[PDB]
Design a protein around this nucleic acid. Sequence first.
RNA 1: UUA
RNA 2: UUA
Lengths: 772, 772
Amino acid sequence: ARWFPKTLPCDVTLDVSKNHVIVDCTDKHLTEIPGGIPTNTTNLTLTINHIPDISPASFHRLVHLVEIDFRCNCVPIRLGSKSNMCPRRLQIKPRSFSGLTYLKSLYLDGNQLLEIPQGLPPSLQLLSLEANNIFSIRKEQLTELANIEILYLGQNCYYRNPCYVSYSIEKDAFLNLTKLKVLSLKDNNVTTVPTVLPSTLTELYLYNNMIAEIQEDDFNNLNQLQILDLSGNCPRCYNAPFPCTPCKNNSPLQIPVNAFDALTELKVLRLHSNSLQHVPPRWFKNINNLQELDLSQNFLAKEIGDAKFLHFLPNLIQLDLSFNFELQVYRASMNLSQAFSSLKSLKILRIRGYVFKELKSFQLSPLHNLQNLEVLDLGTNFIKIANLSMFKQFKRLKVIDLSVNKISPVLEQLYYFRYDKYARSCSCYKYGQTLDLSKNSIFFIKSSDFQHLSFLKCLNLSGNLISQTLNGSEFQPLAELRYLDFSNNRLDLLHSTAFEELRKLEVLDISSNSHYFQSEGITHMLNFTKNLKVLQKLMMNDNDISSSTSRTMESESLRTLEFRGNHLDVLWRDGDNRYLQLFKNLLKLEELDISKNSLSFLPSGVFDGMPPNLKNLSLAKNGLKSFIWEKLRYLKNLETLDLSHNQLTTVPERLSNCSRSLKNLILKNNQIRSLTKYFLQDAFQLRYLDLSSNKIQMIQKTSFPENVLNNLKMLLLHHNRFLCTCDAVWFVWWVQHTEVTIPYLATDVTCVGPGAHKGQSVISLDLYTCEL
Amino acid sequence: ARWFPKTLPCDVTLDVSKNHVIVDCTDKHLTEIPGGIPTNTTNLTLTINHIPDISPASFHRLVHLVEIDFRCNCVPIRLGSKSNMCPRRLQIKPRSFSGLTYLKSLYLDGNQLLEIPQGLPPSLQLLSLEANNIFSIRKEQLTELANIEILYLGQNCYYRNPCYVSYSIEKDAFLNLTKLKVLSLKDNNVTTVPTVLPSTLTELYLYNNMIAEIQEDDFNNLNQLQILDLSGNCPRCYNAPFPCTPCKNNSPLQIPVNAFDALTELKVLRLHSNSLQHVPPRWFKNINNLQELDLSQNFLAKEIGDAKFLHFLPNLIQLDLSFNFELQVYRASMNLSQAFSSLKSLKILRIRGYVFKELKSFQLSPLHNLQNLEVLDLGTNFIKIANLSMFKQFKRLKVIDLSVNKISPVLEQLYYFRYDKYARSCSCYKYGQTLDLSKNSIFFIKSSDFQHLSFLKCLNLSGNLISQTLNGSEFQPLAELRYLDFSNNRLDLLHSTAFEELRKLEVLDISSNSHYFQSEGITHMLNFTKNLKVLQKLMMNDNDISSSTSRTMESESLRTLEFRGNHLDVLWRDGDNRYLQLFKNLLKLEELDISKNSLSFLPSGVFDGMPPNLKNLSLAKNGLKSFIWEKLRYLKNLETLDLSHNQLTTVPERLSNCSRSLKNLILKNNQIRSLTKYFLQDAFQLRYLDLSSNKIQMIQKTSFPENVLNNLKMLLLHHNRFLCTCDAVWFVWWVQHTEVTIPYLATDVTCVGPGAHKGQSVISLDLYTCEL
RNA sequence: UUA
RNA sequence: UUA
Ligand SMILES: *[C@@H]1O[C@H](CO)[C@@H](O[C@@H]2O[C@H](CO)[C@@H](O)[C@H](O)[C@H]2NC(C)=O)[C@H](O)[C@H]1NC(C)=O
Ligand SMILES: *[C@@H]1O[C@H](CO)[C@@H](O[C@@H]2O[C@H](CO)[C@@H](O)[C@H](O)[C@H]2NC(C)=O)[C@H](O)[C@H]1NC(C)=O
Ligand SMILES: *[C@@H]1O[C@H](CO)[C@@H](O[C@@H]2O[C@H](CO)[C@@H](O)[C@H](O)[C@@H]2O)[C@H](O)[C@H]1NC(C)=O
Ligand SMILES: Nc1ncnc2c1ncn2[C@@H]1O[C@H](CO)[C@H]2OP(=O)(O)O[C@H]21
Ligand SMILES: Nc1ncnc2c1ncn2[C@@H]1O[C@H](CO)[C@H]2OP(=O)(O)O[C@H]21
Ligand SMILES: *[C@@H]1O[C@H](CO)[C@@H](O)[C@H](O)[C@H]1NC(C)=O
Ligand SMILES: *[C@@H]1O[C@H](CO)[C@@H](O)[C@H](O)[C@H]1NC(C)=O
Ligand SMILES: *[C@@H]1O[C@H](CO)[C@@H](O)[C@H](O)[C@H]1NC(C)=O
Ligand SMILES: *[C@@H]1O[C@H](CO)[C@@H](O)[C@H](O)[C@H]1NC(C)=O
Ligand SMILES: *[C@@H]1O[C@H](CO)[C@@H](O)[C@H](O)[C@H]1NC(C)=O
Ligand SMILES: *[C@@H]1O[C@H](CO)[C@@H](O)[C@H](O)[C@H]1NC(C)=O
Ligand SMILES: *[C@@H]1O[C@H](CO)[C@@H](O)[C@H](O)[C@H]1NC(C)=O
Ligand SMILES: *[C@@H]1O[C@H](CO)[C@@H](O)[C@H](O)[C@H]1NC(C)=O
Ligand SMILES: *[C@@H]1O[C@H](CO)[C@@H](O)[C@H](O)[C@H]1NC(C)=O
């Protein structure tokens, strides 16, 4: 169909709307800019390659470029690969960019540059030089950037990329940049706010530096500033997972009371990890628009009990006061000031790491009439006691987070403790009201524990110690609960009445409850599903289930069952017929995951035993060594079959003769060495075929008829063992001239032989010598 | 060194003392008996091959054979591989064995034989025919076995290898076998004890059959019997993990009261899973020598409270009454009869699965004066309450087992519930008194819990719910404890005083206590080791440790640290020097396991950071992509280095220049494609080198000097990519003629090329054309 | 590949 | 391979 094969090792996209020709060569092991890049190219990405230099030749023809992304072709030693250390810094020749009249964005982050590159065109709006070795900014080097709006200069001097001196910025270096909106100088070992800065700034990032003092006029002319981040100047260093040097005598960052007086437009103020002991009300006198305030990782425990400054923040949406506890103190109570009640617009309040023994209803009374409050995060507080009934006065909330506490009768895993959570690289909430009790010490539960919480839509009990024989009495008040996460407990399914009181339960997660399934002679009633009349989804992954008192699971409602990481190999021991119908009476089941069940083979009766509307079956990662393909005829509604990461060596003689319904066949990471002669013949239903990471040498036309290939949304063939002899003439031609989407066609569809052509892409292969 | 290359694909051993020539061809993918088996061969093993027949040709020359092991060359469909099903049963021609005048043992198990093979020589003492299809035994077929002493006929008719009829044994079929000592007819669907049996029997195995009734004279003449097993006739089938058919009418196996009167010599009586409700004293009237009695999986709950039969068993060493509970009953107490106190010789008492709520001191009073009691096993009883101080009256015991209970304030994983625990295939006790509390519901511990248990040498708390901040007050009474297993709990290392009260602790296991290490901003005091002055071995595997409040671990005593499955990659993040000395002050440390820590590289300073006496270092399974071999020079006492399952592509230019001490280098499962020119030159200290499962093409003599190779105890080279051209002449010759042990030389040391020689063993490779 |  |  295609007249000219695409040989270029980069993804090319067209967006004729926004008038872009997008060439993405991210991570293609390039040592040169590839030849033959389209002349109409507008966005060119060469991130993560080993191109040692740029010159006038680099972009000679590419005069329509609006964006070059040339990040991480020489990333600093400590940040980059140790197995492929860049030997010498990126070399930028004179006149390399001055021809690109239309260039609006240039990313040269992570190239070990020593200086701000010169001869940039006046069209440039965005320049990024993060993770280089530029630690002295001179006015003279910045004249070329007259029209610049966004300037990223961070991560040029810090523990992962040191310069061993203080950062230098000439007086007024940036003042003549009259269009500058965003300046980032984070993670740079800066000692003072550089002045004077242009009044056109909207965003100023000065975090993770060595600034001990703010002068009262440092921010004087910045009447357009919207975002200010001064975090990590005078850090709180307790349990820091990076090298952390506080200011002497554990002094706070010193901020005059009138330092923010000009910032009428400020929306975000971040003062994380500044060792603050006091938040003076006077700070917020002329900021009436402040929406987000981060005061996490300070020493504001006392202040939280007083907090007069809150009276000046009626427009605040987000407040973060996490990790303000006094070292070596375990308070009895949380003392929230009445001033919290003036936070009229507050949607989100986080106070992790206050560290207190007992949470009581009254302590939260300042929050009672906050009409817009949506999230209350009291995680990581080592709370031992809480009457959960107190949250009956918080029905309007979307999330109550008591995660990581010590109670007994979505932010990243590292968040409050990472160095730079905004650093650039080279869930049941949607069901309604959520009470997150994950990672507590709840060993026993009873109905009264949930009195007055009938409004709850999701309860998270993951990672507790719950070991009891649930009999259906434990959750009686939770009449509206749609989602229970009971993973990482110690469920004992002695009673088939477990969970039946949750009459509106749609999703049950009982994954990683393997404990009692690990000892012989214990009763397990897997038939507990019968009572849950609206259950849609059941997850029982990683339970190590190798035995069951009940022979069948039953549901009229269940659509999805995850049964990964169990021992169906033992339940279906060849010769034992008793569990061959375990899932058959799940009448509405469409999706079954029985990956990771050590099924090295499937006994006969398994497919017959499957429920009638099964659509999506995974048998991945089972060490399957054999498969009777014909048995797929019992799965009359099968559409998706995942057999990835097994040991299959052969495909069926005629797939169409095995299933009338099959659309998506995943066979990646198997041991397949050849395709059968008529493999895909008349498989009119097929739409997706993954044959990647096998050991295929040859594919002949008979296997791959064009009336089937041409309905495929995608065909994966990469990481095989293709033999590029004259025998392969058809496959080589076809691959070169097909419209069919085949990912990695240029990069990992490769000849392994013979000799001459070893390591060569088949897309690039010239076989004229087969045709003389 | 060797004059004639060993080409036979079997391991050949000499024991010139016992005059044996032992040829072991186990699992060598043979379809033929190999030619050239030594003529002096005495023991020939051909287990697990696909040899389709035996004939007079098979053993023509092998006239000194005393033992043929020809098991599992055609194992029944349900028992064998589904990816390589034996197509047709093993064919044994007339006259195949009649020439083997000296043959004493013939194993033909698992070959799908239909009949007992005839023409066996009169020398035969042992014949094994398990897992065949022989389910009718006729006197006529057994005349040839005049001299036979051991006959295994089991697993010829059961659920995994069905015959679909009752087993048939002719009247008196075995009587004329006047030397028969051991008869096994287990797992055979036998319906009556065959009679009459020879009086020379010492062992009779009739378990897992369909025998409903013992006739009073079935065992009349068996005055030499030592072992009788009638288990699994009328099985107790609750929660059975195999298909289990009880006798109708809930009947027990019916044994007349005088059935054992003749068995004066009986030592072992096994009546497991016979649905017994009563144990009549009259059974044991003329058995005064009985040492082992298994009454597990019956219905003897009531009987345990009475048990008059015990008065007749003063010589009994082992009593097992496990799994006798009445279905649907949860007793308050254990009612042990006073008759237990007459068990004068008892060393081992097991009563798992009695199922009761509360254990109290008095309930065990019948055991108080059993002077030789060594093991009391009360596991899997769902006990909720036990004052552990009761065991102060059991100081003399070696093991108190309360594993798998419900307490709160070595037998195989499947044992009582497996079909045939004696079926043939094709720990802290040694420290002294052990209290095993593993797999209970203990969420909190205090010193008083251990009052009066000062004698304990090992405590097992594995798999409890212990979540507390141990401050060193919790185990105060346990002044003699040498071994604490605290794995699979939720250790919170807030206090560096944790465990310090255990002044004699030699082994601490705190593995799989990952819970609190998974959440940011939690204090962990890894320096807690300092206070344990005699600690030899610390295991803290799978703790997911990625952060630590202390920078160094300290011990004067510690020899072995297991730190597998943690996040040293995070602790040693490039640029962070703070934890590079974490193990340095473990001054006597010899063994460090830091496998599975995602160390894709080692920062410089890690080797310098190692303690000075390190002998055995594992860096396995880290995804290591690079390794500065020269830095091994800091490890002046290094003997074993395990770098298995990594991504290394190169070896050092000269290993001797890296380490003077290194004896054992494990490099298996890496990506190594060639060896350096002088790799092993002058590395005379080397004794073990595993280079298996790499991608090596060539090895030249310069890399592999013979003055080093020859003193290797072992050299592993299998599963590489060897190219068998004239360039490989040296390696091929050396491999063919070396004394040095190289495993799998016959099976997986293979040429991948070129063309001709692909898939061929290098041992078998003829390279004469390289020498014309 | 008799569990 | 800026976290
Ligand atoms: C940030 O700048 C500081 C101080 O300006 C640097 O600290 C100096 O480092 C040199 C070389 O290591 C030492 O000889 C001096 O003792 C240090 N001076 C002071 C006053 O501390 C520091 O290296 C810089 N940080 C980074 C990460 O580059
Ligand atoms: C070689 O074959 C002989 C004959 O089967 C084996 O000797 C037997 O070993 C058992 C072990 O329990 C002894 O108790 C018996 O007395 C021996 N039987 C006979 C008939 O002599 C010998 O062990 C075999 N050796 C090897 C390594 O396979
Ligand atoms: C043990 O012997 C049984 C008979 O005593 C076998 O049961 C028979 O099975 C056939 C059909 O397969 C029935 O139609 C017939 O009524 C009879 O009861 C049983 O299969 C056998 N056990 C094994 C494991 O082979
Ligand atoms: N707390 C408990 N947890 C699990 N099983 C229990 C408990 N109490 C009694 N059992 C009984 O133990 C047996 C094995 O699980 C099982 O048989 P059952 O009589 O049906 O009740 C049960
Ligand atoms: N049970 C507990 N487990 C862990 N930390 C606790 C506990 N109770 C109070 N803390 C305090 O939480 C902090 C982070 O772990 C830690 O620093 P600290 O102030 O010394 O005391 C502690
Ligand atoms: C192309 O470049 C322009 C300007 O830098 C930018 O706004 C646009 O997002 C880019 N698109 C892509 C997909 O790179
Ligand atoms: C809360 O703390 C503030 C300031 O530390 C203090 O003045 C106030 O009295 C405290 N209130 C309670 C209820 O402890
Ligand atoms: C919890 O608070 C509620 C008030 O909503 C009350 O009914 C109940 O008694 C309290 N429970 C406990 C254990 O204090
Ligand atoms: C429950 O909390 C756990 C751990 O804190 C988290 O992994 C999980 O995604 C949460 N469950 C849901 C359904 O959001
Ligand atoms: C589950 O199985 C058992 C029999 O094994 C039965 O008593 C029980 O009622 C079943 N439960 C349901 C909910 O169907
Ligand atoms: C099939 O199920 C898997 C879950 O294993 C899911 O990720 C995938 O999208 C499903 N595909 C279809 C077509 O439903
Ligand atoms: C498979 O092919 C044969 C012959 O073409 C035909 O009899 C049989 O019905 C086919 N089965 C299916 C499911 O198409
Ligand atoms: C403790 O018990 C556990 C769980 O049964 C077992 O894995 C482990 O071997 C025991 N530990 C010791 C030291 O015996
Ligand atoms: C462990 O380290 C901490 C400081 O990080 C210190 O307070 C404590 O005393 C140390 N304990 C021991 C036994 O070394």
